[PDB]
Each structure stands twice: as structure tokens, then as C-alpha cells.
């Protein structure tokens with residue numbers, strides 16, 4: 009550290025890493041980039057892939073939401089106990105990313121006409137995570153192993169935003185439901201999730217959720 | 218017999234990079250081929266974590282997700298940077314490669330006819346970041362990150378190779394990426410693999426488009 013998050017005024021792809029930093033008692037600065045400033049062109053041109061989030065860890069500058077998650081996971085010890093668990097953590101995170109991409113596609117490019125098919129396909133997209141929990145200590149701990157990992161924060165956010173998109177989508181999944189309640193009750197995380205810093209930001213940037 | 222097993226369709230696709238990595242690192246593995254016919258039966262698909270392939274086995278460890286397999290081999294074979302900082306940079310490159318691969322896959326499988334012209338026009342802007350990364354790493358004379366090969370190099374190399382097939386000459390605007398492809402492709406073990414029937418007789422994608 010110190011840490012700096014450069015992003016638009018939305019939860020979006022920074023929600024998970026923010027929950028991670030908060031829950032881990034880490035301090036960070038938020039560099040809010042408005043759409044007007046972004047349309048100016050300067051910042052965008054300076055970004056490796058022309059996109060945000062941009063992240064600063066001391067003299068290290070990173071791009072890509074999952075790179076930031078993996079970096080924090082690596083440096084803060086939120087990546088499993090060994091190589092085998094690290095691979096499982098990646099497997100979970102990549103699955104979370106795949107569904108997040110589908111969610112993003114729906115939200116920004118086909119909300120009106122595609123929501124119905126998306127919601128109907130949702131149960132089948134969520135079950136893999138319920139299954140993973142079922143195979144790990146009866147789903148009483150974390151998504152991988154017995155310690156929290158960066159994938160837990162990413163999965164938690166994925167679940168929270170889907171409950172908004174399709175209320176009750178976790179009702180058929182007891183382990184996932186209990187998991188969300190358990191993680192959300194962690195002291196620092198609970199405080200962060202209740203803060204206006206989180207609550208007063210829209211999930212996405214187009215007013216849809 | 219070998220500790221590694223690759224379960225995939227009869228295409229290069231999302232297994233091309235990990236196969237190059239394994240071959241170039243002198244590792245032995247088994248290929249278990251899944252026909253579209255067997256896939257349509259449904260049993261295997263239902264048994265896959267996210268209902269998709271590739272599926273990878275390392276002893277009794279069963280993995281899914283192409284990038285998870287790349288990171289796993291990167292971790293276990295020492296192709297993930299020399300320190301924590303490099304590891305993050307390697308991830309940054311791989312995520313960038315994955316982003317473009319996703320766009321490539323979308324074009325190939327869902328909008329080849331009507332979307333190819335636009336895709337090729339936007340291609341230079343999508344490749345530039347990698348040229349930039351090379352330019353900032355020892356003049357682009359070594360690898361994408363640091364002075365040692367990483368799993369991201371194999372993924373990037375594949376990305377570049379398939380784009381040369383899609384848009385011949387697309388690397389003429391990028392001297393470092395061009396020399397990079399030639400240099401890595403010339404690595405003895407990789408060169409042999411790339412020229413072998415095991416690689417050549419497999420199509421890039423599964424729908425006949427490239």
C-alpha cells in the first residue's frame with residue numbers, strides 16, 4: 009500500500025475488491041472518475057486497455073478487475089493454503105467472471121428483450137456454486153478451503169447483484185443462502201455494506217439492475 | 218500414465234495455449250477427445266462443473282476453466298514471474314488476452330459474416346496494448362513480462378497466431394509483436410509441436426470458421 013481505486017461512481021467491477029479491502033481492514037482512497045471526465049479522453053488514452061478500474065499499490069499500477077483481486081489475494085494471503093487450493097480458487101473466480109460477463113451483457117446491451125431468458129437460465133448458472141459449497145465442509149466455511157479467498161468476495165458480490173435482478177434466486181439453494189448471510193455478517197464487511205459509500209452507489213452505470 | 222489429461226473437443230481453441238506450454242516445457246500429457254456426438258448425449262456435460270470443456274486432470278485434481286489451467290501450470294512449472302509484482306503483471310497480460318479472445322470467439326461463433334469487417338478495423342487498437350507492453354520490457358526482446366517465459370506468453374502467442382489467420386498481416390503494424398511471434402515460435406520444443414500433426418490437423422475452431 010497505500011491503495012488507490014480509480015473508477016466510475018458505480019459498484020460494478022470494483023464492488024468485490026472494495027468488499028475485500030474493507031473486510032481485511034485495509035485503507036484505500038477512491039479516485040472517482042465522472043463520465044464527463046472520461047469522455048474528455050485523456051485518462052482513457054492513458055489506460056493500458058483503455059478502461060477502468062485502474063489500481064495503485066504504492067509504485068505499482070494495475071488494470072483489470074481480476075488482476076487486482078488476484079494481486080490482493082496474493083499479497084494478503086487470500087488465495088488458499090497451497091497450489092491445489094489456489095487452482096480451485098481460480099476455478100471459482102473464473103466461473104464468477106463468466107456469469108458476471110453474461111450479467112453485464114444483459115444489463116448494458118439487451119436488458120429489455122433478454123431478461124426473461126436470462127432469469128429462466130439463472131438457476132442452472134447458480135447451481136455450480138451451491139455444488140462447490142456442498143463439497144467443502146458441508147458449505148459451512150468458504151468457497152474453497154477453510155479460509156476466505158478473493159473468490160469469496162467476488163462470488164458474494166455476484167450473488168448480491170443477482171438477488172436484486174431476480175429476487176429469490178437463492179431460495180432453492182440453502183448453502184448459498186446461508187453463505188451470503190454468514191459472509192455479510194462479518195463485522196467490517198457488514199459495516200461497509202451498510203455504509204452510504206456502498207448503498208448510495210448504483211450497481212451499474214446505466215440505471216439498470 | 219502421464220499425470221496430466223486434457224479433455225476437450227477436437228479443436229485447438231481454448232486448449233491451444235496450454236498445449237503449447239506443456240510441449241515447450243517438455244511435459245507429457247494425455248488427450249481425451251470428446252466428439253460433438255458424445256457431447257450432445259448430455260451425460261459428460263452434466264458432469265462438468267460449469268457444463269463446459271476443457272476439463273483438465275492433474276493426478277486426482279480435476280479442473281475446469283482454460284485460464285485456471287494456465288495459472289495452475291504457471292504456478293507448478295515456474296512460469297508466473299520471479300516475484301509478486303511480476304505475478305500481477307503476468308495476470309494483467311493474461312486478462313487482457315482473455316478479453317480479446319472473448320471478442321474473437323464472439324465473432325467466430327456468432328457474427329462472422331456481418332461483423333468481420335468491423336472487427337478487423339478495430340483490431341489494431343486491441344493489439345496495441347501488447348506492443349506497448351513489449352516496448353516497455355527490455356525493448357521487447359525477451360518476454361511479455363520480465364526476463365523469463367510465463368503462461369501469459371503462451372496465451373498471447375496463440376492469440377496472435379489465430380489473428381494472423383483471421384487478418385493476414387495484422388502484425389505488420391506492430392514490429393515487436395511480429396518479432397515476438399517469430400522468436401517464441403522458434404523455441405525448439407514449441408517449433409516441433411506447432412509443426413506436428415497433433416497440432417496442425419486440428420482446426421482452430423469448431424464451426425469451420427477462422
Ligand SMILES: N[C@@H](CCC(=O)N[C@@H](CSN=O)C(=O)NCC(=O)[O-])C(=O)[O-]
Pocket residue numbers: 020021052058059060061071072073074112312316
Ligand atoms: N476486463 C476488464 C473490463 C473493464 C471494463 O469493462 N471497464 C468499463 C467499465 S465496467 N463495465 O462493465 C470501462 O472502463 N468502460 C469505459 C470504456 O470502455 O471506454 C476488467 O477490469 O475486468
Ligand SMILES: N[C@@H](CCC(=O)N[C@@H](CSN=O)C(=O)NCC(=O)[O-])C(=O)[O-]
Pocket residue numbers: 102106230231262268269270271281282283284322
Ligand atoms: N470460460 C470457459 C469457457 C469454456 C467454453 O466456452 N467451452 C465451450 C467450448 S470452447 N468455446 O469457445 C463448450 O464447452 N461448449 C459446449 C457448451 O457450452 O455446451 C473457459 O474454459 O475458459
Ligand SMILES: [Ca+2]
Pocket residue numbers: 084085086087155156
Ligand atoms: Ca489467509
